[PDB]
Amino acid sequence: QAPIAAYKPRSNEILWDGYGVPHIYGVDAPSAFYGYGWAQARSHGDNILRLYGEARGKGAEYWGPDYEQTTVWLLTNGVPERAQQWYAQQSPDFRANLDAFAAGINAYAQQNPDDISPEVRQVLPVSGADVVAHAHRLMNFLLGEANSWAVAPGKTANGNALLLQNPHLSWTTDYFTYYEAHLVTPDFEIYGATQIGLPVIRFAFNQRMGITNTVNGMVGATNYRLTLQDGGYLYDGQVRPFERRQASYRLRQADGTTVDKPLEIRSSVHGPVFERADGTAVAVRVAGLDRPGMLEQYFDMITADSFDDYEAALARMQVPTFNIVYADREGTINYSFNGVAPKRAEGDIAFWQGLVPGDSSRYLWTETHPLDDLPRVTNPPGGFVQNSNDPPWTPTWPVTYTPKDFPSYLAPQTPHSLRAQQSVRLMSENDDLTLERFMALQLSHRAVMADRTLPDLIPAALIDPDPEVQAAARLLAAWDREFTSDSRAALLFEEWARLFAGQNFAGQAGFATPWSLDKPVSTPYGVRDPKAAVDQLRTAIANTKRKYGAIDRPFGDASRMILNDVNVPGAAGYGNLGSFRVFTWSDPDENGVRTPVHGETWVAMIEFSTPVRAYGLMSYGNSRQPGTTHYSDQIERVSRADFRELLLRREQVEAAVQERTPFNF
Ligand SMILES: [Ca+2]
Prior knowledge:
Elements: E1 13-16, E2 22-25, H1 29-55, H2 59-63, H3 68-76, H4 79-88, H5 92-111, H6 118-121, H7 128-140, E3 145-151, E4 162-168, E5 178-184, E6 189-195, E7 203-205, E8 209-214, E9 221-225, E10 228-229, E11 232-235, E12 238-240, E13 243-252, E14 258-267, E15 273-275, E16 281-286, H8 294-302, H9 307-314, E17 323-328, E18 333-337, H10 349-353, E19 355-357, E20 376-378, E21 384-387, H11 418-428, H12 435-442, H13 448-462, H14 467-477, H15 490-500, E22 511-513, E23 525-527, H16 530-548, H17 555-558, E24 560-563, E25 566-569, E26 583-585, E27 596-599, E28 602-607, E29 613-618, H18 635-639, E30 644-645, H19 650-656, E31 659-662
Parallel strand pairs: 2-5, 9-19
Antiparallel strand pairs: 1-2, 1-31, 3-4, 3-21, 4-28, 5-6, 6-7, 8-17, 9-16, 10-11, 11-12, 13-14, 15-16, 17-18, 18-20, 22-23, 24-25, 26-27, 28-29, 29-30
Helix pairs in contact: 1-5, 1-7, 4-7, 5-7, 8-9, 13-14, 13-16, 15-16
The protein binds calcium ion.
Calcium ion binds at residues 112, 115.
């Protein structure tokens, strides 16, 4: 009935487990934030310092030409200055948490100067405002894939909600690195993953509740085509002069000196002006520049004492983008299509994504939608919600709204990917779910596109006079259509699909029966032009041999996951082919070996039983500092889908501790 007793820390300490996951215990909130900053510095200090240096607008100054483009971009959009403003505009209690986090990073570096790379030492000390700037850059001035599931009690065997956290970002891009951690104070507990440098956990759960995120592509900014005339720009039939402001920055030279570079910032009524290569003057207008509370909003959301508290925090509209999914031990699940969306009187999403006329107040929006204007689903009749980056039109099944219920500029009405179709199928078709079964369904790696095309392609290919084309057809026909390590037909099938549906597998032109929202998990279907498709198979056969050495190389012999000296077989594949579990394989090297560019990173599954039970893995480990043993130590488990029990209970943490860091704050 009531959740288990909350632990009351009596001293400040980090207890590290065998995978480099910090469990940070603080006697108050600022102590916990300090421990967290320390931990992030230990695990990811070099890259965090680099990113903070950038968000300062000092990339060019610290590291030179390779960082200049970002510096100009951030200074033109006023990022470092606005961050100072946002910092001052924080509530006093939350500002103190940001200060403690920064102090934690500084203290780590001070105590361990040998762990900080020479190039990023000049960044120190860091400040609460540096923290705010990085978050500002990440959310506003930086598409990524993810899956998300929440399952209501009545859909489960035990009667407790289930939650999947499953973001698919790059395995290399530094600011997209996820980090796993656990924070405990007398007043709250949070477990989960977040991007390095963020002082709040974005993929969080505790004994009461949890949330996950996916990219919705919230159209938060407008690009306005300006009509230049007589030194200014035409607007409402009149010539307006630009606002002009002289700035400057330092650029590091090869000889270690810096050089002063002038930067003129021009602005129209819309916002700062950029000149494109072709000569088009474009004004960029970003919504939600006046929303300083995004970090505190996430923090209040994840530490909410009830669903009502959660929703009230969400409704602050300080988080500019993202689909957000929620579940709790009380049994509530919710999907929210979130972000800061301008109110507009006309135009669909395509109009607002292109260049909008910058010559008229007709297109100058000034207000944004409250939470209640955006697509949301709570405790639907189907007993689940999902999003796999599909437009928000099948977040549950049966649906609870249609496209007509919302302004046409909020979200597209384009065909749902085969991954998103699988997502809906896997939840809706299963009842009486256990955590074990939930996890088994997460591993789904079906070549759904093969189900949609092979029935037409095979017989067409078998009538080709080329015996090699015939052999390829039989190879494809014998395939179980799963992306398993041992599959001899999967690589060939991918190569054919690159032609049939484009290099991203999203092309629609080749199906016989087009996608339809009336049949949203069984269209598109069929091969429109079978003879043409056979010609594509012919080309694909040559492509497969060239890339991999044969038409029947085992999928997991070519597809490997390789970190340090760990090299294990791959399984699952591209989302747009229908694989739910995603590994976006790179192009092969000269030996036909390829690895994930993006895909599964932080993967966690939580049952809100009492106490909660949760399992997870992090593909690229919990640290990327040179010399760490916690980079390649999880990938072998990933290759066998061997998830770790995630440990939130004090006795569990104490039994797993491999390193103890007492701290003072
Ligand atoms: Ca050390």
